[PDB]
Amino acid sequence: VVFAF
Amino acid sequence: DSISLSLINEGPSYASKVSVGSNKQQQTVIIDTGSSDFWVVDSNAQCGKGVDCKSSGTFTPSSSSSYKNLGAAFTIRYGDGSTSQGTWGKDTVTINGVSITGQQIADVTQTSVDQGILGIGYTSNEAVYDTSGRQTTPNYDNVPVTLKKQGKIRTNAYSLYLNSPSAETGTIIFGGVDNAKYSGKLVAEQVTSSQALTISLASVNLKGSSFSFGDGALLDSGTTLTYFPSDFAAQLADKAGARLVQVARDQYLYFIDCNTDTSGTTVFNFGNGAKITVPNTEYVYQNGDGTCLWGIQPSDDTILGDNFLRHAYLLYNLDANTISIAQVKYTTDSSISAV
Ligand code: NA
């Protein structure tokens, strides 16, 4: 998973 | 005044039990330094296709006397593509027996994430924009800011101890630092973005070579693996033997053989002589199906995720705009001081 851009 | 909170190692993510509402509805939510909003899974949410989003606690606004429905739609999209939508609200939030009142949160009624997320990054990274790009609600005090404003902690800061790769649990400490859990001295590194908790990564040593970097790296508790720009990741992959595989029209992943030798370490060199050593065990990730991902992946955004962060003790200080780092020492010993 990869959490905010 | 420090607040220790147990981190549950879920595999790809670390989560904590917190409570929301007047009736202390228990939520197990991802602790995420890479986002800034706290949202919970509504008990009547419609989960995304194939997603079991209601298995880690749900929130029922109608049974909380203190729940406030703000006017306003909530939407967020994460780096992995998952999304959540719902409405902005406020309620009481309780973190290891410490309650903050009127904390702005989102009540999520549709999501492709498995559980709620407690985003603890900078307020300037709050998802307050709709998919038109318009700001629809103001920036606001997120959880760490409110902890400080309500007198629970002195400084908007927190220390991260994910613990060892096999550990069931680690610890996050709001407003404190556990001086028993690292060797040497914590070295302060300047945060290089006003929105993201990034620090300058000078170089990476792998397999006896040094690879010059010299750009920012996001220290993200809510990312599983490590991400580097394509050309740099390819330089490292060349030593490791990881192979790029196209998995979608525009998505490529590094795979590696599951039985690949994991002896050796990878060393990450930051400002002021700070150095983190990661065992190469962290670079083989088991998928469901007898294939493995390499622990490094390509992205235009550089991210040191959990497979790095497990090997550092980090004191994030959002008031000072510093992250202080030292090589982790795995121990039950504890000597916490307030920050
Ligand atoms: Na992405």
Q: What is the resolution of this structure in A?
A: 1.7
Same-domain status, B144 and B222? no
Residue B286: count other Cβ atoms within 10 Å of its Cβ.
Answer: 11
A1/B224 touch (CB, cutoff 8 Å), yes or no: yes
Cα(B48) to ligand 1 centroid in Å equals: 18
Catalytic-labelled residue, pool B1, B220, B231, B257:
B220
Total domains, chain B: 2
Closest Cα in chain B, distance from residue A3 (Å)? 5
Of B37, B76, B223, the CB nearest to A1: B223
Q: How far is CA B182 from CA B29, B150, B331, in A?
A: 26, 30, 9
Dist. CA B86–CA B74, nearest whole Å: 5
Same-domain status, B339 and B327? yes
Same-domain status, B334 and B288? yes
Residues lining ion ligand 1 (Cβ < 5 A) are A 5; B 79
Segment (H or E) for B143? helix B143-149
- Tell me which chain A residues have a C-beta less than 8 angstroms from the C-beta of B298: none
Residues in chain A: 5
A4/B79 touch (CB, cutoff 8 Å), yes or no: yes
Same-domain status, B110 and B189? no
Same-domain status, B200 and B331? yes
B221/A4 touch (CB, cutoff 8 Å), yes or no: no
Closest Cα in chain A, distance from residue B39 (Å)? 13
Same-domain status, B180 and B226? yes
Dist. CA B330–CA B96, nearest whole Å: 22
Of B77, B117, B301, the CB nearest to A3: B117
B220/A3 touch (CB, cutoff 8 Å), yes or no: yes
Same-domain status, B153 and B74? yes
Phi/psi class of residue B208: alpha, beta or left (left: φ > 0; alpha: ψ in -120 to 50)? left
Concatenated DSSP letters for B266-309? EEEEEGGG-EEEEEGGGGEEE-TTS-EEESEEE-SS-EE-HHHH
- Tell me which chain B residues have a C-beta less than 8 angstroms from the C-beta of A2: 34, 78-80, 220, 222-224, 227, 303, 305
Same-domain status, B156 and B203? no
**B134 contacts: CB under 8 Å, gap ≥ 6:** none
Same-domain status, B243 and B138? no
**B2 contacts: CB under 8 Å, gap ≥ 6:** B153, B173, B174, B175, B176, B336, B337, B338
Domain boundary among B175, B190, B218: B175
- Tell me which chain B residues have a C-beta less than 8 angstroms from the C-beta of A4: 34-37, 76-79, 119, 121, 125, 127
Q: For this structure, is B231 an active site residue?
A: no
Compute, in degrees rounded to 10, the torsion defined by CA atoms B218, B220, B222, B226: 70
State the DSSP code for B319. Answer: T
**B316 contacts: CB under 8 Å, gap ≥ 6:** B33, B157, B158, B159, B160, B197, B219, B323
Segment (H or E) for B238? helix B230-240
Cα(B46) to ligand 1 centroid in Å equals: 24
Closest chain B residue by Cα to residue A3: B222
Closest Cα in chain B, distance from residue A5 (Å)? 6
Q: Which domain holds residue B35?
A: 1-175
Dist. CA B66–CA B247, nearest whole Å: 46
Contact B27, B41 (CB under 8 A): yes
Contact B105, B38 (CB under 8 A): yes
Q: For this structure, is B220 an active site residue?
A: yes
Closest chain A residue by Cα to residue B13: A1
Closest C-alpha among B216, B236, B246, B244 to residue B278: B236
Same-domain status, B111 and B66? yes
Same-domain status, B133 and B209? no
Domain boundary among B158, B175, B192: B175
Q: Which residues pair with B255 in a beta bridge?
A: B243, B293
Same-domain status, B59 and B79? yes
Domain boundary among B175, B208, B227: B175
